[PDB]
Amino acid sequence: VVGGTEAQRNSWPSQISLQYRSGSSWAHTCGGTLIRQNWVMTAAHCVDRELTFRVVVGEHNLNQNNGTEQYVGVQKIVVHPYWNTDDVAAGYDIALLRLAQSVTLNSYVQLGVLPRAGTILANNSPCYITGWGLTRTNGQLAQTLQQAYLPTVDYAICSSSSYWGSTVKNSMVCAGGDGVRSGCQGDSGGPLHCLVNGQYAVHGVTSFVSRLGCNVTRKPTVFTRVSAYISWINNVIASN
Numbered sequence: 001v002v003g004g005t006e007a008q009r010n011s012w013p014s015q016i017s018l019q020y021r022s023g024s025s026w027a028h029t030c031g032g033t034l035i036r037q038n039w040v041m042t043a044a045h046c047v048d049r050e051l052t053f054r055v056v057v058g059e060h061n062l063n064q065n066n067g068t069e070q071y072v073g074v075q076k077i078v079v080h081p082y083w084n085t086d087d088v089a090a091g092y093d094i095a096l097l098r099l100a101q102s103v104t105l106n107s108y109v110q111l112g113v114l115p116r117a118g119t120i121l122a123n124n125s126p127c128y129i130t131g132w133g134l135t136r137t138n139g140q141l142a143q144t145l146q147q148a149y150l151p152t153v154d155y156a157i158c159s160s161s162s163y164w165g166s167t168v169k170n171s172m173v174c175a176g177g178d179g180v181r182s183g184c185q186g187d188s189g190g191p192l193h194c195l196v197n198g199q200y201a202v203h204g205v206t207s208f209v210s211r212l213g214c215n216v217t218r219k220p221t222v223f224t225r226v227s228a229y230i231s232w233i234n235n236v237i238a239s240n
């Protein structure tokens with residue numbers, strides 16, 4: 001997250017870190033959202049490489065013991081059947097991960113609340129992106145979880161020629177674009193939490209940013225619209 005602030009320890013308990021095995025250690029590669037005690041929602045692009053993955057819940061500082069983490073392997077990966085790595089702009093950037101064990105819920109580990117199907121936010125709706133992604137374009141990951149206020153940018157504006165044009169679809173949410181605050185590499189897969197009727201709900205799965213850089217004016221961070229895939233999500237969870 002570029003232009004973020006350090007999140008308080010118990011503010012976003014559904015945020016997870018998805019990590020891959022690297023030698024005798026583990027490396028963060030993407031965020032995700034815990035949606036069932038044994039299921040996490042993340043981006044399909046985060047699992048395009050055939051790596052060994054784990055999920056960490058209750059995480060705050062990636063480089064030190066917080067005394068609140070739980071570590072669990074990924075037993076099954078279900079990517080949206082229409083996902084294509086050659087066309088992230090086509091959409092369908094969503095995947096569900098069945099965990100090998102069910103995690104224990106507590107004040108640091110909670111399920112993410114999803115929006116009702118079909119819900120679309122009005123332009124300029126209040127949302128926060130969270131994650132341990134790069135803190136600058138071509139920078140390095142954050143040690144501590146970061147948050148940034150990124151107001152939505154509706155579809156008509158987001159798909160206009162000076163913003164993202166035809167690259168953005170109505171199956172995505174855009175947020176940000178001020179040239180200061182944004183998601184960045186390593187935030188992919190995580191949540192976009194937006195306040196609606198007094199409750200934060202996860203409306204987006206972080207998907208992409210401009211090839212020009214993370215925080216680029218009129219290139220808001222783009223997210224898979226969670227409310228377009230509620231049936232798919234429930235269908236997977238139920239048939240697995």
Ligand SMILES: *C(=O)[C@@H](CC)[C@@H](CNS(=O)(=O)c1ccc([N+](=O)[O-])cc1)C(=O)O
Pocket residue numbers: 029030045046047048049133183184185186187188189206207208209210221
């Ligand atoms: C996500 O982090 C976005 C920017 C918000 C970037 C792409 N994702 S990534 O850099 O985390 C990533 C993770 C995993 C794979 N893979 O397994 O192939 C690829 C990329 C971005 O849009 O540049």
Ligand SMILES: [Ca+2]
Pocket residue numbers: 059060061062063064065066069
């Ligand atoms: Ca830690």
